[model samples]
Target: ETSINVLSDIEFTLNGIYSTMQSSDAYSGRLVYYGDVTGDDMQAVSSTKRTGNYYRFNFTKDNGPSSHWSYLYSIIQNCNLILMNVDKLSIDEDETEYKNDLKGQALAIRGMALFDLTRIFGYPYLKDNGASLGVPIVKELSTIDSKPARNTVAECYTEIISDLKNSTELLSGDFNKGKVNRWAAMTLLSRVYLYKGEYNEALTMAENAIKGAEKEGYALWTNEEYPTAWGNDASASNPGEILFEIVNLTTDSPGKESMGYLNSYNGYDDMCITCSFYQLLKKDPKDVRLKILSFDKKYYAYVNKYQPQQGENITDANIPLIRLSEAYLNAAEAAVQTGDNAKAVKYLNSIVQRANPENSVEGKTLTLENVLDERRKELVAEGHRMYDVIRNGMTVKRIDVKDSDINKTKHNTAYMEYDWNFHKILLPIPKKEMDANPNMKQNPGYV
Candidate 1:
């Protein structure tokens, strides 16, 4: 094949694998197929709800087939193709670095996809019987003559960590402002390590990742700069401190509608900010994050994180997957865990200094509770509260919310079922995957 043909193929492969991670309408059909069904919220309503498509996901025994496995498998195929053909492709001597960069990024994306799959379809990272069957392992780019049996969760993490470690090496000091690079790989490795309770390893990786980006001039978005970060007119061109984002150019695309803010009274606005968290935020009236969140007279604590160009526009906004602030938070958590109280305080103070200069203090003593408090305040409505809660093994009762009208909205909203501890931690496996791949068993509670 011509060099141009090879380049096009590589690009196509990358795009194809990346699309599986798409947050647009493409994944909507599968969310209900795999997500928890007992929750009153996030279900499709037949008539009263405007977006009735996935309403059945809210009902018991109505969890649809798990199509994500197949979708993710197809994504893996694309990754394998790229890995198989990367070295054979023709390119200029000067462009070799670019080619290698693309190849490394492809591996990182592929590795992340596998990691996400194993986490969702299999067991938690630190399970005792982690050696038990997990997701099917796909190594090469070919059709299997026989159905591959599931690997243990330990085995899955082994592959994931290996890929990430190798990927970071392959990325070797290569940094990109816009795409996945060495730092991104390391950041992900830090997350994986932390999840597996390898606290020392996680801390080392997080620190290394932070140092790698220190010269890149990335900083946390200031309180004043925060509003425009997710404003209606925001685009990739207006980069201040974003690390990774799924670009959504509202046009002729499936994701255009699915990824956009569903302001339409009919579409799914299932996820809302919790009143408990909202009240915590209110404790700091000067906190600029209040402007980023949304509210209404009826729903006092709904998330307004999204701002579309128009009422029906879903394609205008890009979803921020990773950012500099996340890096700071990672570093802070790692520092606290490793007993580097000074370093932990440094990272946390740096973030708060940007947002609340008046309250920022130097040499601030740091505790796990203090670090977590800052994390909760900083990462609210970013789909992280539950994960943080699960990983910390903290008591859920400490987060007290009054059983008032605010709780009423929490109970009434379609996505309000996240209040309970059991529902907060677990998600049901997609039913289709279990039926199709008998080896891929359901989670404990779901089973």
Candidate 2:
């Protein structure tokens, strides 16, 4: 049994959970990149081997499923270990708050991990009210022989909401950068509610998170400061908007496997921006967000959001899990759904004006489609496009030809399309998981 007889032991254990989350197999590499590539915003380069299956919508149970499954479970297990041991440990009155805060952080990590796993492996909640099979809910520490069955998506969400509510209550203190705090929990709660199509709850949580975060000095970066936020140096401070980020240092970067290297033209160049998205960004040359993309020798646009900073040639950029801007976007979308177009416009304008002051929509009547388009522009490459489209019952439209011939292929057999009804929307459960647990079943359309 892992012993936690002291406050320091609890602190060390919580730190270990965060460290495991930043590993290449987790957020530092695969999670961030996989979300975008699996959608229509990006396409795999011809030389890309590992992520090619994702772009082609041809994931197999054996095709690199362990990174998300094994690693996320490892994080949850460590969280379970902390939860099981921390309350049993004795602490002084002065350290009691510290212990509670540590426990809260652990719970937040576990909840967030399970939620991400469910989104990747299970059907979207909009379909069947999440009655479909989802990832297993493993709250307690498990042995090698343990083989828990998958939980219903609705059940998994219930547990996630419960953990986050507890986390918000137990966590208290001044805002801590790069760590889960009250606002972080609340923000994640908003995202969860949005996924569940609970608009009123999402709007309330998003509004609270945004208000609390601003009071704590979290604000959107100005246009001038936006370009340098992804600096090449490890010493560079994060922008004011970051609510929680996964820290990755030069000494521990994933090197070639990092999202920066995979997306950048100056690196492995394994992924390129889809031509349709590039055209969307080009609609306004004054859009500062366009700077997030760069062109190769052939003028093909590639993502530059994770470029090398300082003197490092490899990717050392910290992965931002949540930001204040996202809260605004979430609030805006939820507001639209809840029949508050005025409030929606207020939140939407905050992000748009910050990016381009001249393009602000002050008096214009805002529609849900308008807000969503702004989200697609503002939150590009941050892993929001696909979910936004899917949850809204919108079809993903990709341009299949070269940018020069877009007009010619606009009406012909030059595009690939995937609808929400397709089985590719959810990844297949890993074969290893099915083989290990007799009750485990693969997702539809997969052997």
Candidate 3:
């Protein structure tokens, strides 16, 4: 009998949406597994415990990690419900600001869900000029019987941009560590443009977001603080690179379901970086980013980025969804595309000089490859590698490791690097959906 026509109720609903995203099946860990699980950055040390399917590309629609599709759509459903109820609310004069903030957040969450879903299910936007099939767009509260077909990748990007644009307009410029603010929306909007190959637009939005975030006191982690900044707990006063993050509280986190837990020696102890990434970062002995690393007995290195601030609970570390460094790198890449090396190097220095204060990139020239290499080191396990790999039209040539081979036959050394046209890159629509909805289309490779 509870109604959502009141302001406080709407606030609770928004909080609920954030909670949904924090679930183990969503952003808390599984979604993070989606991108980097089988990507070039790393390989799983253990085969079972939910990591095998993604690692070997073994599952069909019948048994693949199909929960991701449902979990994200669930988030979109909540956003639709919130957006609908917000429009029906009778707003008081003083409550208009609160209402706008709620609506803006709802729209941003919806956009992010749609965007992530498309990324998981469709080809990169650069492929065939975005002619691939994307996930279905369900912007409204639909009935149980409704069957929506997937939209084209181009159409999906258009919808994502519209949501983010309106999101930026309505969000406040306030610095929120665990919630999307104006700067966060702008950063994501710019990333969307960058993915679509609209370099000038991405650069412009990134420039605006960086300047505004700087004014809001979002500072880069200096050499002194870079070692442990990733482990810092997010609070009201957390002044770190992260713009928007998921607050995994001590009491409310995904616990054992988290990849942070799965990666840690204290838990499953099965995650390790690829030898190539290790070799690349190994070139520089004085890189400050190395302080976060602790080598595994069995593998070359482990990603300590999700170092837990709390005792013994690996999953307790907050997940940073977007950060100011992403904006800098995005700006750098876009500037290079637009033939502005000076601007690109200027922004590239902002990131490179921070990671290694002694080695300022201001004295060095930046090429597209140079910018991408910096991004590779900067954003290792944060789920950017696959998108970065595909959009560049490069093959996913993972450095061979003993652990990378699941078996002699399953993941053989003969087929080491996967081309951009690899059929398994796009996950199939779950067989449950295929059977339930006639409109559902499976990806290219699935039977």
Candidate 4:
């Protein structure tokens, strides 16, 4: 038996709880259940008035705060329970140190859950008075006899930073390369700093993490691993480049088979390759990512990047939450932002070289625009397009709106009409949250 002290059990429970919070069909899959349209995938589904097999988004006024927040809070509760009971668990000297390592992972993940909730539910971190309007600052484990009010964005970020900092200090000597450790905490700090516009801190943390990973022999996986990393039989930690993942081995792993096989096979309304990505792929014929797309007689191309085999379903593939590529990109972007265009080019070429050696220009330099395009090409279809657009302060253009007359006359109610900047930028705080927690307010335009 893998038995340990109560504190160890508590830490294990916390880890499992957050892992279970991985996005599923009822949540992330609805992004596709609606239409073939593409822009910012995350906001498009949550902010639009469109209805489809996913009707929960339609019952706004009647619905209470979203279940997403509640799920995160559950993880928070488990972490608090573990922290509170830490002193009570008796163990040997070596075991005691190991227990602390486990606690550090729990705290880091708990902080991450809380930070994600605040970002999605509240305003941007830079907003002046907006800092205070973040999600509820849940710290300790307790029953909800009384509803909690939303905290400021600053307050939420402060807590996130503090929790991560504490995690870093506690995990300093621990190097569990395959799992969350001090380096992961440092990476998270770099992420938080970038989001907060703390350039110096972001750069320092990014550099430190890169140096540490390099020392630990962590580098980009070769091109062969790109497509097969998410194969049907992939283990919970299959991709060596993946820094962290929310394991979803259960039957309910959302969009596991549908996005992996159904969309790729039937070629029915495939949104995997957008006009932008298609254009980029055409620019360079040697890029193997282009191989991930398959065309049918209908002239429709689907994404096969994650497909395991010709006839197998893709329900069991592990979900990659973070990748080594992200770290490199983060470093490149931060270097550019800090006016080190040369360093940015070095990082950009590193990635491009792997995908297309012929396209790699020697002694090439980069601009902010170049870095932005690199990010787009590198991180496509990973549920990151919208967030990248928003973070880069760019506007979304080329809306492919379906004609209403065509829909009515041709019985094609599914097609959409594109209007640039037509919908709200961010999703309204899930109406359920607003109704249940009086302190939680809806985002702009939803009111």
Q: Candidate 4: RMSD over Cα atoms?
A: 5.8
- Candidate 3, residues 112-154, lDDT tens digits: the string is 8899988889998998777989889998876889899999998
Per-residue lDDT for 81-102 in model 2, tens only?
8988888988789988888989
Clashing pairs in 2: 231-309, 232-309, 232-310, 233-309, 233-310
State the displacement of the C-alpha of residue 278, model 2, in Å, after optimal TM-score superposition: 1.0
Clashing pairs in 1: 41-414, 41-415, 43-55, 44-54, 44-55, 65-432, 66-432, 260-314, 294-304
**Ten-residue stretch with the least lDDT total in model 3:** 404-413
Query: For each candidate, C-alpha RMSD in Å?
Result: 4.9, 2.9, 2.8, 5.8
Per-model lDDT = 0.58, 0.76, 0.79, 0.56
Q: Which parts of model 4 are misplaced by more than 4 Å?
A: 1-5, 23-65, 127-132, 171-179, 232-239, 250-263, 266-271, 294-299, 305-312, 361-365, 399-423
After superposition, candidate 1 runs with Cα above 4 Å error: 1-5, 23-67, 127-133, 142-146, 172-178, 232-238, 252-259, 262-267, 308-315, 361-365, 395-408, 412-426
Each model's backbone clash number: 9, 5, 0, 16
User: TM-scores of the models, in the given order?
Assistant: 0.80, 0.92, 0.94, 0.78
- Across residues 1-447, which tens digit of lDDT does each residue of candidate 1 receive? 432256767877776655555544334223312221122212221224323323222422236334455666677777777777888878889877777767787777767767767755554555453554557678776453445667777888888888788777777453353367777788888877766777788878877877775556544677777765664343334445555555444563444234244422323554444456667767778777767664444444444444454543544545555566767777788888888888787888877777677776466677777777777677654434444544455443322255353443342333433322343234355665555556555555555
| Ranking of models by TM-score | 3, 2, 1, 4
Best by TM-score: 3
lDDT of 4 at 2: 32
**lDDT (tens digit, per residue) of candidate 4 on 1-447:** 433366647657755665555554322333223222234221121222232212222333335235556667766777677766666788788786677777787677777777767655665565453453677887765565556877887888888888877776666433343356666676777777777777777777767776776566556766766655545332334325555544444454545323443345342233434434555565787785666666543334455544433344454334444566767777787887898877777777777877777776446566666766776666655555544454445554433333221221111123232221322333456766666667666665467
Better candidate number, 3 or 4, judged by TM-score: 3
